[PDB]
């Protein structure tokens, strides 16, 4: 989830 | 042949690429020697005086650079030389920097004549302890601790205003900065002033609004209290010290916590048994997870330095409850800290009173969830059987570190396989043989590298503890009936082994048990397997004798000297010109 | 009855000391849960337009249920982590303090409630303690706090001196001594209005606010978390005295990341921020320092700062500067855009910057085409000598 | 000839162990000598069991240490990685900078395959980048390292039967040999077969979908079952995103995912694992937590 590119 | 090298520096001091002037500052000291100091001290450190830098990776540099200068700039007598600039470096913004600039003036302090100091050094204090600056009054502080005991009485007296200027700044900043100072400024100031005027700042900064500020106070306690001696102590120190422990701001406490034995000692063997005993309860019930485990840590050594005359008996009625709630506290690192001290406890209770009471709690842990509380108390069972009857042990605690040989955190399986040659050497070989054997056997194989090399090596320690001949009955057997497993990881474990158990099995049992499949196997399959083969003839070289070596060695480490697979090469080749066989 | 000024004094008494630590799950007797919500639509919903009796047991009963030490930090050290990373910590028993805040706001927030019904019951002490809290439950709890001091800045005349200095010493411990504090944002919100709104001919308290305190500010790597709060202050400062426009610009300069792409790309971007509103007397004495900068940024290895970067070519005022200053600008930014781009891997800034060359030309011809001169001319020499 | 070199490798190794970089002009130096190695290598790597398969890495230094404390340690142990070797992390160089070390070293020990990150584009935006600068002073480490990683073969067949890759299926690939003739000596594409092999994912959506990550599709159950079928594969291994458990099987055991980067990111709270292929090609998956820092 820290962003789509991937938590 | 030249000193052109040298005289580009002196260019490159200015040269308006960072990349550069850094260079050259950063060897400044090669400078100013091939300068030549009589120089140095008259167009050098006038330059680096005039001359505001912006960068700070330079900033930081010169400000290194100048604590050295001591001899370049002609010793001593000139010393004072070096002042002005660092005196600038000390005002800069970007800490660090400053920092630096501080860490210097010290160093070089030292090498003022007094005469010097009250006239060029102290001077450079006062002028940054009045700064409108907060920063300069911040450094300032980190200053006084190295003139006072040299300058004059008079000196001495205006050095003590300043400082108590610093402590009460209307910047938390500054404050925080006098606070942590305070403790090593007493440590010079005489006798006399710590008690009337160190005190009064120490309470003062002990009690600020800021509880950042605050809490440094604590520190300083610690100091002072070695200061002065005990009666003063219930009057000057203690009602303060006690004040922190309760102060409403958790990290204060904390502090009284990781300072608690530091305070012990200072206070006194008395003053201890008077207000920190119940104090340090306080603490270990406190509403802070922190300040309770942190005071948690301190327990083994808050007991160890208890009076020689009631340790047992405070330990027992005044510490001894609160552990035991400690043991089964919700958060973690509380029961995680405290476990790994715990059982330092047992040689002041006795045989006795450890089973009885402290053992329970042994076992509470040994089983907990958090690995961490098993891991801490599994590391320091090498003791116990020191205290406990190594009966008592192997009866009501060997079952649990049966049961641990195997729990799933492996760091943790590691832990027991680490204190095994002891309880094997302790419990004994025919107890070993029995009912522990087959476990030393089952971790030869974990899923886990990291345990099955903990094993291999754990016997070589065990044939050191039961003889070469134990090994040829209860071991060489199983470490050979491996090579059979199809897994290339376990197969090689036996070659592993092997390579450990040479070094303590006579050249007899290695040559009549062991050499024969560390040849059988050089015709495996999976290449690694092959490789490590002559990586272990290597190891298992030497112990062999000279008849052996050129006649089943040699000629099979020959074999795969001229084998596929480039490894088993390289390793059969350096496998000879070790063993000086070619 | 119809006697309050005895019903209240004694029901927020009751709402006060309450004091139930919601960290263990029991004792499920609301009971306060209703008080408050009470107070609230008692003070609201038009129930009440004359409740100044002298009175301050709200404020105590505030700086009660919100005074405490906040707890240790449930987020990692700080080195190799970021904070726009950290899991938000909320604070449970919210829902009760949720209305402590929403009451003591939509208390001195209404009319009639005199300032001096508070003006000695609400002191610095008070503000300061106040201040800290500005510490960790996902803005919620902060939110409210940036809201609170604002309205207790905008309303004591005489506390704007402490809470605006004892901002600054939040800030000069958050970047000098510890690089850690959660409501840097939030605060610097509060200090937009502030700004916003400053003596016409700025007292020097506010420059010094500006250049030693905000600026600085910028130096910080979490700058990610604060960085739009910041520029605003730093432009918003600018609109009331472009006279600061010069140093605000050769600070930004100074400081300019060397190991942060993603910061480099927020300092451009604020400089845009910037420039958008330079004012042309002032746009000159930063001009050639600045578009040297943006120079290296066009010829950047970093995909998204050169992108960032080139971006400057289409805005219509930054553009307009440039032309009324070619002259000097132009030959700055060539051997960069002009820049043998035939080396590149991110297909994209070739085209680019042809487009911002093309930009280049519809603006003056002739100096366009005399730079490109200059340029190859030197380029020669540079490749025949150069070549022994 | 021989023992100039290969005893300086073992060093650059035993130092980059200790988790200290190797200089600038040791970097160009080691990954020159990678390429030449790594252009022999075709865009389907056979290589040979057992082995020891590893997925996404990402800088988590440390935690690359905890697996060889699982795995075994290189040679003694045959490995292979699924790209994603950079970034995130804080010790990205140190953990590429030895991966490679140690295949320019023993060359048939180790196999290495490129990731989703393994490009200019990625470890710009992500780290890696950075990271370089904040430890080179240049940006020389970043092109010598984002260059090598051209050379780095797409996919590997484990004994003809198991099938790796860091990402998944794509439309415009059908057969293993339609991958041997791509060319992926060249940065990762934003769209096209190459690409997709580093991005594409699992889906129970069904059919070809759209990644809602921007590059690659959503293969699903049976894009894979046919894949498997057709080539004459009995199982495809990847791993490309965060499987909190370590592992996961989909798809009716057909493809399965590998991530290795425990607690990843140093936040998302995941065991990680690694698979081991003995001798006979067995299914032993090892799982471990972050190791103690
Ligand atoms: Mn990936
Ligand atoms: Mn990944």
Redesign the interface.
């Given at each position: 989830x820290?962003x789509r590119x991937x938590x | 042949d030249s000193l052109y090298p040298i005289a580009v520096l002196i260019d490159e001091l200015r040269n308006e690429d960072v990349q550069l002037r850094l260079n050259s500052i950063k060897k400044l000291s090669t400078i100013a020697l091939a300068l030549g100091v009589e120089r140095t001290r008259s167009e050098l450190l006038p330059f680096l005086t005039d001359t505001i830098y912006?960068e700070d990776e330079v900033l930081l540099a010169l400000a290194e650079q100048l604590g050295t200068f001591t001899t370049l700039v002609g010793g001593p007598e000139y010393v004072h030389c070096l002042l002005p600039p660092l005196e600038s470096l000390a005002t800069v913004?970007?800490?660090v920097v400053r920092d630096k600039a501080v860490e210097s003036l010290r160093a070089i302090s030292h090498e003022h004549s007094p005469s010097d100091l009250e006239a060029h050094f102290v001077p450079l204090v006062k002028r940054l302890a009045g700064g409108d600056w907060?920063?300069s009054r911040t450094s300032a502080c980190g200053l006084f601790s190295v003139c006072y005991p040299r300058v004059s009485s008079a000196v001495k007296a205006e050095l003590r205003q300043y400082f108590r200027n610093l402590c009460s700044d209307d910047?938390?900043?500054v404050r925080?900065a006098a606070a942590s100072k305070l403790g090593e400024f007493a440590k010079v100031l005489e006798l006399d002033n710590v008690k009337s005027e160190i005190i009064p700042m120490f309470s003062n900064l002990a009690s600020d609004?800021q509880?950042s500020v605050r809490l440094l106070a604590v520190e300083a306690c610690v100091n002072i209290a070695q200061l002065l001696p005990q009666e003063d102590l219930e009057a000057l120190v203690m009602p303060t010290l006690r004040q922190a422990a309760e102060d409403?701001?958790?990290?204060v406490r904390y502090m009284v916590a990781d300072k608690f034995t530091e305070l012990q000692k200072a206070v006194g063997p008395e003053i201890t048994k008077t207000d920190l005993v119940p104090a340090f309860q306080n603490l270990m019930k406190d509403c802070?997870?922190?300040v309770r485990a942190a005071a948690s840590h301190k327990v083994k050594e808050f007991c160890e330095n208890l009076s020689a005359d009631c340790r047992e008996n405070v330990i027992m009625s005044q510490i001894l409850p609160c552990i035991k709630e400690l043991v089964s506290d919700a958060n973690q690192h509380v029961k995680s800290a405290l476990a790994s001290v715990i059982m330092g406890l047992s040689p002041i209770l006795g045989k006795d009173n450890t089973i009885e009471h402290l053992l329970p709690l042994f076992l509470a842990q040994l089983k907990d969830e958090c690995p961490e509380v098993r891991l801490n108390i599994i590391s320091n069972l090498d003791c116990v059987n020191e205290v406990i009857g190594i009966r008592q042990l192997s009866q009501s605690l060997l079952p649990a570190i049966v049961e641990l040989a195997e729990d799933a955190k492996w760091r943790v399986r590691l832990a027991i396989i680490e204190y095994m040659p002891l309880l094997a050497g302790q419990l004994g070989v025919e107890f070993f043989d029995e009912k522990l054997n087959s476990l030393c056997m089952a971790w030869l194989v974990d899923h886990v590298y990291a345990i099955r090399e903990a094993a291999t090596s754990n016997l070589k320690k065990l044939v050191e503890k039961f003889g070469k001949e134990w090994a040829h009955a209860t071991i060489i057997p199983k470490v050979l009936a491996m090579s059979g497993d199809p897994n290339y990881l376990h197969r090689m474990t036996t070659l592993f082994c092997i390579n450990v158990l040479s070094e303590v099995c006579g050249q007899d049992i290695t040559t009549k048990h062991m050499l024969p499949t560390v040849l059988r196997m050089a015709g495996d399959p999976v290449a690694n397997v092959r490789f490590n083969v002559a990586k272990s003839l290597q190891k298992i070289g030497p112990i062999l004798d000279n008849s052996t070596l050129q006649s089943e060695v040699k000629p099979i480490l020959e074999k795969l000297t001229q084998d596929q697979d480039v490894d088993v090469k390289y390793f059969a080749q350096e496998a000879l010109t070790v063993l000086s066989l070619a | 009855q119809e006697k309050l000024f005895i019903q209240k004094l004694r029901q927020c008494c009751v709402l006060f000391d309450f004091v139930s630590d919601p960290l263990s799950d029991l004792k499920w007797k609301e009971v306060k849960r209703a008080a408050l919500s009470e107070m609230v639509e008692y003070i609201t919903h038009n129930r009440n337009v004359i409740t100044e009796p002298i009175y301050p047991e709200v404020v105590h009963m505030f700086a009660v249920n919100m005074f405490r030490?906040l707890?240790?930090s449930s987020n990692?050290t700080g080195?190799?982590?970021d904070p726009e990373?950290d899991?938000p910590t909320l604070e449970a028993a919210w829902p009760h303090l949720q209305l402590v805040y929403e009451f003591f706001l939509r208390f001195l927030e209404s009319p009639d409630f005199q300032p001096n019904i508070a003006k000695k019951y609400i002191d610095q002490?008070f503000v300061?303690q106040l201040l800290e809290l500005f510490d960790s439950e996902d803005p919620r709890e902060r939110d409210f706090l940036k809201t609170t001091l604002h309205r207790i800045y905008g309303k004591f005349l005489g506390l704007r001196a402490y809470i605006r200095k004892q901002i600054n010493?939040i800030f000069?411990?958050f970047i000098?001594?510890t690089e850690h504090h959660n409501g840097i944002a939030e605060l610097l919100e509060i200090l937009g209005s502030i700004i916003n709104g400053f003596a016409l001919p700025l007292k020097e308290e506010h420059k010094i606010f500006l250049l030693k305190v905000l600026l600085?500010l910028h130096?910080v790597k979490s700058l990610s978390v604060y960085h739009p709060q910041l520029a605003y202050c730093v432009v918003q400062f600018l609109e009331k005295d472009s006279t600061l426009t010069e140093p605000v610009v050769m600070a930004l300069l100074?400081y300019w990341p060397?190991?942060?792409?993603?910061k480099e790309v927020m300092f451009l971007n604020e400089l845009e921020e910037i420039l958008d509103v330079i004012e042309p007397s002032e746009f000159v004495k930063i001009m050639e320092p600045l578009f040297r900068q943006l120079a290296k940024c066009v010829s950047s290895?970093?995909?998204?700062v050169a992108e960032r970067a080139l971006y400057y070519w289409n805005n219509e005022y930054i553009m307009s500067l440039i032309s009324d200053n070619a002259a000097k600008i132009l030959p700055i930014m060539f051997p960069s855009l002009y820049r043998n781009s035939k080396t590149h891997?991110?297909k994209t800034i070739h085209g680019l910057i042809y487009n911002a060359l093309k930009l280049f030309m519809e603006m003056n011809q002739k100096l366009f085409d005399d730079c490109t001169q200059q340029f190859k001319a030197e380029k020669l020499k540079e490749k025949l000598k150069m070549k022994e | 000839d021989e023992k100039v070199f290969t005893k300086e490798l073992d060093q650059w190794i035993e130092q980059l162990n200790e988790c200290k970089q190797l200089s600038e002009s040791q970097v160009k130096s080691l990954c020159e000598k990678a390429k030449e190695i790594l252009t022999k290598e075709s865009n389907v790597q056979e290589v040979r069991c057992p082995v020891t398969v590893c997925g996404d890495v990402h800088g988590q230094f440390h935690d690359l240490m905890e697996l060889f404390r699982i795995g075994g340690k290189s040679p003694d142990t045959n490995y292979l990685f699924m790209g994603d070797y950079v970034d995130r992390g804080?010790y990205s160089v140190e953990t590429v900078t030895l991966l490679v070390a140690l295949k320019v070293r023993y060359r048939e020990r180790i196999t290495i395959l490129r990731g989703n990150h393994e490009s200019?584009?990625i470890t710009?935006?992500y780290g890696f980048?950075?990271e370089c600068?904040?430890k080179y002073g240049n940006?020389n480490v970043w092109?010598y390292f984002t260059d090598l990683f051209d050379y780095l073969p797409l996919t590997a067949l484990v004994d003809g039967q198991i099938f790796c890759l860091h990402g998944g299926l794509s439309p415009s690939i059908d057969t293993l040999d339609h991958i041997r003739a791509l060319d992926r000596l060249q940065?990762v594409p934003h769209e096209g077969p190459m690409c997709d092999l580093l991005w594409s994912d699992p889906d129970d959506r069904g059919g070809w979908g759209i990644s809602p990550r921007g590059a690659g599709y959503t293969f699903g159950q049976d894009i894979s079952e046919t894949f498997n079928h057709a080539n004459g594969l009995t199982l495809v291994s990847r791993a490309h995103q965060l499987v909190m458990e370590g592992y996961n099987w989909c798809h009716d055991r057909n493809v399965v995912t590998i991530f290795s980067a425990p607690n990843y990111?140093?936040?998302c709270g995941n065991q990680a694992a690694i698979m081991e292929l003995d001798d006979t090609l067995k299914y032993s998956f090892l799982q471990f937590d972050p190791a103690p820092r």
């Open positions: 820290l | 912006d913004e970007e800490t907060f920063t910047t938390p900043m925080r609004e509880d409403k701001s958790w990290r802070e997870a922190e | 030490t707890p240790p990692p080195a190799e982590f990373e899991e002490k300061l010493n000069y411990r000098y001594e600085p130096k100074k060397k190991t942060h792409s993603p290895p970093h995909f998204q891997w991110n | 804080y200019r584009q710009q935006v980048y950075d600068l904040r940006a092109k940065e990111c140093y936040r």
